[PDB]
């Protein structure tokens, strides 16, 4: 039997404050930099 | 001209209703969508479809270029443009003949000559026509303003030109009384607007909404398909409509089409289209308006008449002459049509957006018609109409028909957002409405009645909930089983059997408020003995499937019945012929999160709508009940108003600013 | 006469046609069977089936004796003959009484005088129905052929009796010019033929092959029913046959009826027969022939009429009075049929033979019947009649019921030899045959219009390809993903990730002789971004199953279609109601076998036939294009030629050999 419910874990971010947005600003330009160098590799 | 390619210039029911007459004549079919509408029904049903660009109507359905330019793509030689959007533009059909495309409706010219109230009753008092009614007068002497409430004969309304909510509004029951209550109306008009410019609009009585089915063709010759009530109606919407019209003689009708089927001949009308009166309570009739295109409601005079009226409007449309003479025309039985909207009629018939997670439906036979376009997990969209789908009847007779769509529309059900069905139930089955005694106030003067509050349930109705938990629970043991190597174990049984005593399970289950105890005892034989309160029922039952719907067969001391059972969260549906019943189980503490978080931020955008008004400054103290802003919605406004006392810590939107739907307004300072 | 069991001397569409008719009434069915047909439809059919002997029409369904001792060994009461083989043979129809067997058609009488062309004529002249026509004079004298010239009307065309190929032909366009041409003619045949017998055969206007259906009765009452016309004939072959014949009025239809029932009085006709007319521009007709048989394209008349003319061959052949009075009988809306044909169009018609490797047939309405006795699987055979199946529609009118048949045709899918589908659907778009001005030189005149060549594709119908074959790829991968342990494993999805970039494979698709490179991406959200050549195409679908058919559903560039898709061998098969499209997938060198056999045997057999002439010793030298041997197969002449210009090494077959299809005929010395 694998029917019983249970919790989950994560809670929604606060895509408006401020540290999220500099926080996904600054883990975005690193992965943009990650792509391009693998492209020229 | 031969038209073996259609547009169809629309969406929803309308485009899957034109689509199967035009498949069924062998003529292709080109859907046009929006973005919202890419897994729409009409799309997947079409021969072709393209893309119209976003979901906004502006954008999409009603941009005359993008139509006309799929149009040429697809090499379509003609355009269906289906029940509102551009069916009624009159340059859209030109447009389409300047293009060399086939408009399948009326002129361009008899679309203007209607559209316009003055301009269309002018021409239907010339055609013979009655053009009679009551109407507000922009003029403001004492004289002129007296000599048009005796026009209109009293008693009279004395209302503001400007303004809302009843203030400067008088009633004047006979012509002594009238400078009295005009000076009374303009004093409180002048104080509340600062205008003192009064209407005059008061027609004696308007009780039918009774409408005729007319059709013409390019040669001119026009007939008349017997008539429609439509008198049961909320604020203009149409709810119910009946054909043919209850009480109107054969002789009345007859005369009733003949003198809107010369109107038709004057403006040599192409195409289906309605001539709407309104009905005294002597069966006196007066031209109310013509509607330039094929009716929602149109359902009840095919069911009626046995015609296609899309078959007709696509014949007509390539030139053909009419197929059946006036002769030739016959009525049998009678026919009834409801439409199912996305509304809650206990918030006042609030519009509701959300997704249907359970569209089941009545079986269709050809006397019941399912005009559906939409399907089991489609979303209603905010952007487009409200409407669910239409249910018809044909019967021998009125009352065998009234009788068939109540008993059809408790088959029909609906999870996961607000339906008027309920209402329907409700109205169907009022006493004035089976007697025939129906007009335009039915809605308003019966409120009382058609609205009714949820009563306590019944304790077999609360047995036959714990029974469907039971067996679903036994359903999921037995899916468990099939996936194990040891298959045929005694454990994987469902007895819940004991050593020389019996198992006695105690079930708590909630019914509107109340928590309700149940001891359900597990017997040897495989039945349950179920005690609530001071009362034993003896319960024996299974589930089987009847299509993709799982069907609740029980035994509740001695009686037998059937129900549909559905287990959706935490709530039980059981959907029977008797009625439905819903049952909610209760959700563990641990398992509620047991994270309350209070009342962060104020109330959220009742929908996506235009900031009208914000009564806030950025530090301003509020007590419950204080309005903070006011948003207009699809034309709806929504006034916004303080959750607690709290000092308002700031604010996310100003005035013009378009709100999303659920989005925080105010920011409130944590206390 | 109590008729509860019959059999059915016949095979194939019209064995389980008459069946079908037999088992609504009751009536028990006995079906025969060559070798060749244990497997067939009919045999299934049937509530018995007898073994008639080996596949050769001649040896089986031909054979008189076999067929009598089945319907005395099944205790069979009647005999059904259908269509062809015995049905006009008046001994097995003498036969049958004879033997106290009820034969289910025209007397033995009525099948003798109708069989000889001269006696037909003569009884048709006596009953008032025209004689006229143009015919072939064997007297040589240079007056008796000039005054016979003169009768038929100039222009006339002088032919040798002797010979083919135009040799001997002289037109002669007045009564000046007749002795010179005559002369010329003569001269050429004595020349090429050593013979100088001349033939004067020629019809001013034979335009028209419209003929009625007529049902005669025992007792002697005749009826009809309306016309038919079969004008659009390939070689005399009937393609495509309509019912009414068009332009010909009520009024004249009726006359053209009354004098052909009244030649059937005549013969007191029992059972159904056809008078064939000939018909000129004037509509003056005049009478050509009687078909003593049930004609192939009954089913015209059968839907429009609304009768099942094998029940009235039944219920006559019982005994009964005609179901129906001529009063009775309405005639309402138009219908089409066209005779599906294993042939090849582009190869001047030739029949093909082969297996129906794919059969998928439109779905089918009271107006649309498919008449078929062949199933997927099933193999034309060489032995029997190339018809695949026949496709009859009614409609209200006649262009509505030829939309109908065109887009019915596209839905007809047929892989594994050629057909005459193609060339049905141009003929039925031809102007001329929508306008119904057609004659039986319709084809003749036409055949420019009619065969065309295949036109390169779109880069959309290849990006569709691409888009199936993956789709293919992927339903592989869930197949295989179904029998293993690991069914979750992220490594069984179908995406192409690649870890930071993405993944773009190079396809290369042959369309005709073109090679075409497609650069397909495989995007993250699941679609694919193919470029071919210099333009992108966004694609997404997927695959979903109708039936036993697999649907491909697909959007290029927000353009969203659906249709069937078939992977067979290396073809990829797209079937859309815009039309069918093939795309050949290119076979890797390896896979193909490296050094083939190269040297052939001299062209093999086109099909089983006798030699009828060798034109190679044991020992010759040959160029390319040197005939070696003439073979004829089912009277159709063939000329093997050389393949090389290699010497001869030695000849497997002598003149009057059979030789079986695909075997070798010459040996050439190894050079
Ligand atoms: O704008 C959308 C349609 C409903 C509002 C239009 C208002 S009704 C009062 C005024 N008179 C008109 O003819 N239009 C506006
Ligand atoms: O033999 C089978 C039927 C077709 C060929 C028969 C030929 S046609 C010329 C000649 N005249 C006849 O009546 N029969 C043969």
């Known amino acids: 039997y694998h029917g019983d419910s249970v919790a989950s874990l994560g809670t929604q971010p606060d895509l408006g404050s401020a540290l999220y947005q500099e926080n996904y600003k600054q883990m975005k330009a690193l992965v943009n930099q990650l792509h391009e160098r693998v492209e020229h590799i | 001209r031969n038209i073996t390619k259609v547009l169809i210039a629309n969406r929803g029911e309308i485009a899957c209703r034109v689509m199967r007459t035009a498949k069924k004549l062998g003529v292709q079919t080109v859907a046009v969508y929006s973005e919202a509408d890419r897994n729409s029904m009409h799309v997947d049903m079409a021969d072709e479809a393209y893309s119209i660009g976003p979901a906004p109507s502006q954008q999409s359905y009603l941009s005359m270029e993008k139509i006309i330019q799929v149009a040429k793509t697809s090499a379509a030689q003609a355009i269906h443009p289906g029940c509102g959007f551009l069916s009624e533009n009159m340059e859209f059909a030109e447009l ?34 009655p053009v009679v009614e009551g109407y507000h007068g922009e003029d403001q002497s004492d004289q002129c303003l007296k000599e048009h409430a005796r026009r209109i004969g009293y008693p009279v309304m004395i209302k503001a030109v400007r303004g809302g909510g009843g203030k400067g509004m008088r009633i004047v029951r006979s012509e002594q009384e009238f400078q009295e209550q005009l000076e009374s109306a303009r004093r409180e008009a002048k104080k509340s607007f600062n205008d003192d410019a009064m209407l005059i609009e008061k027609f004696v009585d308007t009780p039918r909404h009774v409408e005729v089915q007319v059709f013409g063709d390019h040669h001119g010759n026009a007939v008349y ?35 809107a089927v010369r109107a038709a001949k004057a403006v040599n009308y192409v195409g289906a289209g309605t001539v709407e009166f309104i009905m005294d309570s002597k069966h006196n009739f007066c031209f109310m308006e013509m509607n330039t295109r094929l009716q929602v409601e149109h359902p009840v005079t095919e069911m009626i008449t046995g015609t296609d009226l899309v078959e007709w409007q696509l014949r007509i449309a390539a030139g053909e002459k009419i197929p059946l003479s006036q002769e030739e025309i ?6 009834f049509e409801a439409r199912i909207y996305a509304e809650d009629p206990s918030n006042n018939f609030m519009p509701v957006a959300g997704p249907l997670v359970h569209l089941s439906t009545p079986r269709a036979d050809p006397s019941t018609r399912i005009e559906t376009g939409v399907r089991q997990g489609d979303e209603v969209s905010v952007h487009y109409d409200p409407m669910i789908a239409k249910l018809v009847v044909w019967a021998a007779d009125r009352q065998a028909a009234l009788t068939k769509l109540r008993y059809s529309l408790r088959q029909y059900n609906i999870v996961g957002l607000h339906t008027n069905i309920d209402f329907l139930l409700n109205l169907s089955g009022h006493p004035e409405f089976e007697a025939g005694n129906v007009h335009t106030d039915f809605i308003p003067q019966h409120h009382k009645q058609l609205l009714l509050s949820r009563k306590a349930a019944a304790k077999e109705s609360l047995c036959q909930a714990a029974l469907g938990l039971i067996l679903k629970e036994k359903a999921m043991t037995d899916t468990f089983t099939l996936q194990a190597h040891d298959q045929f174990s005694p454990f994987s049984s469902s007895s819940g059997r004991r050593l020389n005593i019996s198992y006695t399970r105690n079930m708590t289950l909630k019914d509107g408020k109340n928590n309700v105890a149940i001891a359900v005892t597990y017997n040897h034989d495989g039945s349950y003995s179920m005690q609530i309160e001071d009362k034993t029922f003896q319960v024996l039952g299974n589930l089987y499937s009847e299509g993709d719907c799982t069907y609740l067969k029980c035994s509740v001391n001695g009686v037998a019945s059937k129900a549909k059972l559905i287990i959706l969260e935490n709530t039980i549906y059981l959907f029977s012929k008797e009625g439905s019943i819903e049952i909610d189980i209760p959700v563990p503490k ?16 009742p929908m996506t709508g235009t900031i009208e008004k914000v009564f806030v400054k950025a530090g301003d103290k509020v007590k419950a009940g204080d309005s ?20 308002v810590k700031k604010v996310f939107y100003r005035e013009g600013a378009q709100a999303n739907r659920h989005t925080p307004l105010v920011e409130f300072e944590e206390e």
């Not at chain 2, 293009?99 to 559209?115: H, L, N, Q, V």
């Not at chain 2, 641990?590 to 955008?605: I, M, N």
């Open chain 2, 225 to 259: 398909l017997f008539e429609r009530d439509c008198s049961v109606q909320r604020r203009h919407q149409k709810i119910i409509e009946e054909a043919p019209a209850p009480g109107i003689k054969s002789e009345v009708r007859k005369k009733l089409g003949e003198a």
């Open chain 2, 330 to 335: 016959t009525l049998q039985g009678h026919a």
């Open chain 2, 628 to 647: 903070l802003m006011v948003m207009i919605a699809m034309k709806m406004e929504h006034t916004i108003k303080s959750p607690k006392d709290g000092t």
């Open chain 2, 590 to 605: 641990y398992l509620s999160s047991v994270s309350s978080q209070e009342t962060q931020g104020g109330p959220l955008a």
């Open chain 2, 96 to 129: 389409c003949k300047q293009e060399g495309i086939i408009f399948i409706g009326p002129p361009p010219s008899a679309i203007r000559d209607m559209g316009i109230k003055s301009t269309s009753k002018s021409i239907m008092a010339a055609a013979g026509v």
